[PDB]
């Protein structure tokens, strides 16, 4: 416990994350506690092992550093670099909807990270708007990578979220990329219409809408992406025109997507279209007013022989 | 089958129509400039309540309007407590945070428009929002007591005079 | 020292209904308990004083003959009749779509109770799905009558229908008893379409939908109901069917009520379509359950003169 | 603007039929009468899971079934513990009382009609609600472990051979 805590940063099914100050240098960093309670109550050691094996030899601009990792007799704390700025979903909900350049940059970053993951045979798995961090220099970062896999192979994993699924995952059918593409067709919708994509008071309606691929043309939508949205939803994948294995010779040759200078985007140089307003060390204006829950340290050994790989 | 909803009782403040005695014309007096008055009128015209009001009531509310100067890092209004005030962001930007199962999620801000706590004047209910300071600014508005009193007085005058 | 409580039946933002049993004879009954702590802050003595006279103003079958109330140092109790059956809101939520006979019977009962309330010129004021209980005898009963009041002049106490509020009162203006139909008209939608009327959560959207004269008509409504809903669509409901001389001509002579007979129901002798199952006394299975909450209040006087009339 | 519900994960046991366990072809068939199977097929031939399935898998699922006699008044399932079973509506009135924020409320009574409990087979989710038995009856206790194992094994064998 060589880290002085300050204030909690987030709590959810994924776990708990707090803010700490490096005693050996003095810098704000994030500390994620594995807890292991829900892991033992829900069996989630395979995902953690896969994420560890992946991070053991994986490093790219769209990834968070792994600096010092601490395991106790019954707990584990992973340290990471903090990126003051907040998630983009908060700003999207505060304003309403972004413009066409914003969606273009989002799609460019998505295809870039997809190509980066495919270069080393990897699958993103989970994808939600609550896993993005925008710094002051424009360097975007992604968090939450436990839902991944070393090699694609051919398994039958079931996870994610009900709001991002396809018929291939409901009845496992490999979905080596459909889960990462079909669901993506709805992501843009969340950043286009003035209301959430799925709005129903029962999961049966959501399942029926996911199975019955049909996008409802909003009352105010650009005619450029209309044709793309009218075909993004499909069953198979070979029939899709823009779906080459390279993934660069299809999105660049699109109608609206043409001037996407990826050479300057992948090199981290072009500034983001919306930089957050800073104020001081560890800003909180962009983040929510969440409070801190009851914290508890370790007492004795209970499940220390779990991650027996270090 | 459905998420469903609660059926909580709702409340509003009472009044005694038999009590005709009131102020001479207005308690708070603060005549602003012409540009500020025009901007306030244009911002209020977008509200549904100001669609049927006559120029007389508009001028009365403008003359009786109350201005409050909020500095940076200031905090007065808080969630949970019974709401008893109302203001309008005349300028600047202030993000409002609303509770969401123990998480003060954000809703948005306003810029020379909007109305923080516009529904609180329609019925008595606890504070369902949280305001936070950002920079020096001025907010124009009126509390619920005086607003309801003036509204009821105007209603009684329009009902009895005719 | 007469009635002993058993368990709780349901608490709200006004009172708590619970089950009680008499110590002398022994019979299950309902008892509404209220705390003056919440009434002193809101000051609602005018609405409570009406119950003192409504207790005696009862000379009809529909009018529930309330029992004698009892005021304590800091709590009030009021015993009422027992309802072995349940509420109509629960049945509607369980089914969500009534047939033709059931809808006709419900409309006839609504018209009968409205005529009964108008005969005495007693403003109903309060109106919600919870104010409709189904007795074991196969009839309908109304609860919560404290909001009722008859004044020569107008009024301004806005309290009862916060959601189903006509656009004539949202602007802080007068109103008449005819509004009782409007606030209830939307309810018929729930018994026709299958989903709630307002498909939103923020009050702003509900107000915009109420002010915006537009109501959908799926392929599930009747023939006369469609015309009745289309006739009432303007904002300023000036041509109301209730604001007439007797108020029982245009509604009864309408095509919807092709066959009616109020004399048969006046004497109470027509079996309901389906009466709830009565599994002997204490059959509280139909009603919704609730957590137990005893009376934890200190025996101390708190403004007695303010609660003299009772 | 909205309550904004949470978006928790829906992970579960990663069933990798390749080198797991030791047994093989553990079908464990439980035959019964023909009238019961014929009556259950009418409802089984309309679920989203059975609307697009091989006849062999449907026949195997219909053959594999365990019965459980439940009398009146028995809290076999309660909102709180983890959920691993799929109950089929065979006969008898069953009330679904959900603990909406710690308050019991009837969702939808089932009487030899409808279908429920399939959500438990979608992913790891706790008990949906309390299933109160108003009278004696015989329900179908289909555990989650059996359903994915053959349903994935048949597909794997077909993909390896065909």
DSSP bridge partners of A212: none
Q: How far is CA D139 from the centre of its chain?
A: 11
Q: List the subunits that have 3+ CB pairs under 8 angstroms with B.
A: A, C, D
Task: Verify whether the Cβ–Cβ distance D12 to A159 is below 8 Å.
Answer: yes
**Which residues of C are designated catalytic?**
126
Binding-site annotation: residue ranges of B for 3',5'-cyclic AMP: 49-162
Q: Structurally, what CATH architecture does the domain formed by B67-161 represent?
A: Sandwich (2.60)
Inter-chain residue contact B102 with A291, CB threshold 8 Å: yes
Cβ contact A177:A237 at 8 Å: yes
Q: Is the minimum CB–CB distance between C10 and chain B shorter than 8 Å? A: no
Nearest CA in chain B to D5: B100
Asked if residues A62 and A41 have their Cβ atoms less than 8 Å apart, the reply is no
The answer to whether the Cβ–Cβ distance between A159 and D11 falls below 8 Å is: yes
Cβ distance of D12 and A158 shorter than 8 Å? yes
Q: Which residues, in sequence order, are CB contacts of B158 under 8 Å at separation 6+? A: none
Give D108's contacts in chain C (Cβ within 8 Å). 94
Please measure the distance between the N-terminal and C-terminal CA atoms of chain C and give it in whole angstroms.
18
Q: What is the DSSP letter of A153?
A: T
Q: Please state the domain extents for chain B.
A: 67-161
The answer to whether A152 and A124 have CB atoms below 8 angstroms apart is no
Q: Using CA atoms, how far apart are residues A193 and A191, in angstroms rounded to an integer?
A: 6
CB C182 within 8 A of CB C237: yes
Task: Tell me B100's DSSP state.
Answer: S
Evaluate whether C103 touches C257 at the Cβ level (below 8 Å). no
> Could you give the domains of chain C?
3-84+279-300 (3.30.200.20), 86-266 (1.10.510.10)
C302 to chain D, closest Cα gap in Å: 32
Q: Following DSSP, what letter does each residue of A171-213 receive, concatenated?
A: TT---SSHHHHTTHHHHHHHTTSSS-S---SSHHHHHHHHHS-
Task: Give the DSSP letter string of chain C.
Answer: --EEEEEEEEE-SS-EEEEEEESSS--EEEEEEE-HHHHHHH--HHHHHHHHHHTT---SSSS-----EEE-SS-EEEEE---SSEEHHHHHHHH----HHHHHHHHHHHHHHHHHHHHTT-B-----TTS-EEETTTEEE----TT-B--SS------S-SSS--TTTTTS----TTHHHHHHHHHHHHTTSSS-S---SSHHHHHHHHHS------TT--HHHHHHHHHS--SS--S-SSSSSSS-STTTSSSTTSS--HHHHHTT----SSPPP--STT-TTSSPP--------------SGGG---
- Which chain A residue has its CA at the smallest distance from D16's CA? A155
Interface of A with D in 65-94 (CB under 8 A): 93
Query: Pick the catalytic residue: A1, A126, A283, A289?
Result: A126
**CB-based contacts of A97, cutoff 8 Å, min separation 6:** A191, A192, A193, A194
Euclidean distance between CA atoms B131 and B109, whole angstroms: 10
Helix intervals (H) in chain B: 34-45, 55-64, 144-161
Residues on chain B touching D107 (C-beta within 8 angstroms): 1
Report the Cα–Cα distance between both ends of chain D, in Å, rounded. 53
CA angle B109, B94, B57 (to 5 degrees): 75
User: Which of D61, D36, D34 lies closest to D47 in space, CA to CA?
Assistant: D61
CB B107 to CB A94 under 8 A?
A: yes
Q: Write the residue in C129, C158, C211 that is nearest to B48 by C-beta.
A: C211
- Pair type for strands A76-81 and A69-71: antiparallel
Six token digits for residue C13: 């933002």
Q: Is residue D148 a known part of a binding site? A: yes
DSSP D44: H
Query: Is A35 labeled as catalytic in the residue annotation?
Result: no
Closest partner CB to B11 (pick from C12, C42, C89): C42
Q: Give percent helix, percent strand, percent coil of chain A, each to the nearest 5.
A: 25, 15, 60
Structure tokens at C63: 């009018």
List the single residue in B1, B4, B106 with the smallest CB-CB distance to A93: B106
Closest residue in B to D116 (Cα–Cα): B1
Class of residue A269 by CB neighbours under 10 A (exposed 0-12, middle 13-18, buried 19+)? exposed
D10 chain-A contacts, CB cut-off 8 A: 158-162
Q: Is D4 part of any known ligand binding site?
A: no
The position carrying tokens 């709780």 is C8
Chain A residues near residue B102 by CB distance under 8 angstroms: 290-291
Residue B25 to residues B22, B39, B54, B149, B151, Cα–Cα distance (Å) = 8, 23, 17, 12, 13
- Residue C64: left if φ>0, alpha if ψ -120 to 50, beta else—which one? beta
CA distance A91 to A95: 6
Contact criterion met (CB < 8 Å) for A285 and B104? no
Longest dimension (CA), chain C: 61
Q: Are C110 and C188 in contact (CB under 8 A)?
A: no
- Contact status, residue A231 vs residue A181, Cβ threshold 8 Å: no
Give chains near A: 3+ CB pairs under 8 A. Answer: B, D
Chain C residues touching D3 at Cβ < 8 A: 201
Rounded distance between C-alpha atoms, residue B27 and residue B30, angstroms: 10
Q: Residue A212 is encoded by which pair of tokens?
A: 């019955």
Q: Does C13 touch chain B if contact means CB atoms closer than 8 Å? A: yes
Experimental approach was: cryo-EM
Whether residue D6 and residue A13 make contact (CB cut-off 8 A), yes or no, is yes
Tokens of D25: 């072809």
**Contact at 8 Å (CB) between C190 and C92?**
yes
Q: Report the length, in residues, of chain A.
A: 310
Hey, is the C-beta of C289 within 8 angstroms of any chain D C-beta?
A: yes
CA distance, residue B100 to nearest chain D CA (Å): 6
* Set of chain C residues whose Cβ sits within 8 Å of the Cβ of D109: 94
Q: Report the CATH architecture of D66-161.
A: Sandwich (2.60)
Spatial CA neighbour of A142 closest among A150, A134, A153 = A134
Beta D125-126 vs A15-22: how paired, if at all?
Answer: unpaired
């Amino acid at each position: 416990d060589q880290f002085e805590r300050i204030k909690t940063l987030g709590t959810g099914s994924f776990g708990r994350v707090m803010l700490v100050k490096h005693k050996e240098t003095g810098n704000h960093y994030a500390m994620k506690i594995l807890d292991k309670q829900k892991v033992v109550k829900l069996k989630q050691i395979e995902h953690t092992l896969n994420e560890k094996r992946i991070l053991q030899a994986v490093n790219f601009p769209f990834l968070v550093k792994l600096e010092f990792s601490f395991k106790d007799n019954s707990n584990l704390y992973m340290v990471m670099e903090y990126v003051p700025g907040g998630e983009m979903f908060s700003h999207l909900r505060r304003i309403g909807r972004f413009s066409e350049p914003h969606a273009r940059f989002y799609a460019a970053q998505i295809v870039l990270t997809f190509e980066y993951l495919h270069s080393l045979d990897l699958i993103y798995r989970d994808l939600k708007p609550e896993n993005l961090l925008i710094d002051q220099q424009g360097y975007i970062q992604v968090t939450d990578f436990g839902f991944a896999k070393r090699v694609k192979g051919r398994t039958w994993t079931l996870c994610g979220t009900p709001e991002y699924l396809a018929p291939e995952i409901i009845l496992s059918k490999g979905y080596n990329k459909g889960v990462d593409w079909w669901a993506l067709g709805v992501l843009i919708y969340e950043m286009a219409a003035g209301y959430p994509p799925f709005f129903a008071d029962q999961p049966i309606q959501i399942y029926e809408k996911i199975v019955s691929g049909k996008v409802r043309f909003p009352s105010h939508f650009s005619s450029d992406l209309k044709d793309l949205l009218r075909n993004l939803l499909q069953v198979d994948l070979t029939k899709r025109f823009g779906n080459l294995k390279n993934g660069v010779n299809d999105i660049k040759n699109h109608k609206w997507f043409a001037t996407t200078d990826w050479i300057a985007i992948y090199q981290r140089k072009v500034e983001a279209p919306f930089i957050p307003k800073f104020k001081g060390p560890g800003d909180t204006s962009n983040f929510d007013d969440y409070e801190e829950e009851e914290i508890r340290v370790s007492i004795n050994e209970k499940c220390g022989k779990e991650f027996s790989e270090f | 089958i459905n998420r469903f909803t609660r059926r909580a009782s709702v409340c509003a403040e009472a009044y005694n129509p038999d009590e005709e005695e009131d102020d001479a014309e207005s308690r708070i007096i603060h005549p602003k400039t012409d540009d500020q008055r025009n901007r306030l009128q244009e911002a209020c015209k977008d509200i549904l309540l100001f669609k049927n009001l006559d120029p007389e009531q508009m001028s009365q509310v403008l003359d009786a309007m109350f201005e409050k100067l909020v500095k940076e890092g200031e905090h007065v209004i808080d969630q949970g407590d019974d709401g008893d005030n109302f203001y309008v962001i005349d300028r600047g930007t202030f993000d409002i945070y609303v509770k969401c199962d123990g998480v003060g999620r954000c809703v948005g801000n306003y810029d020379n428009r909007g109305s923080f706590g516009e529904l609180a004047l329609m019925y008595n209910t606890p504070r369902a929002a949280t305001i936070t300071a950002t920079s020096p600014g001025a907010l124009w508005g009126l509390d619920r007591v005086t607003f309801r009193r003036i509204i009821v007085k105007n209603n009684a005058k329009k009902r009895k005079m005719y």
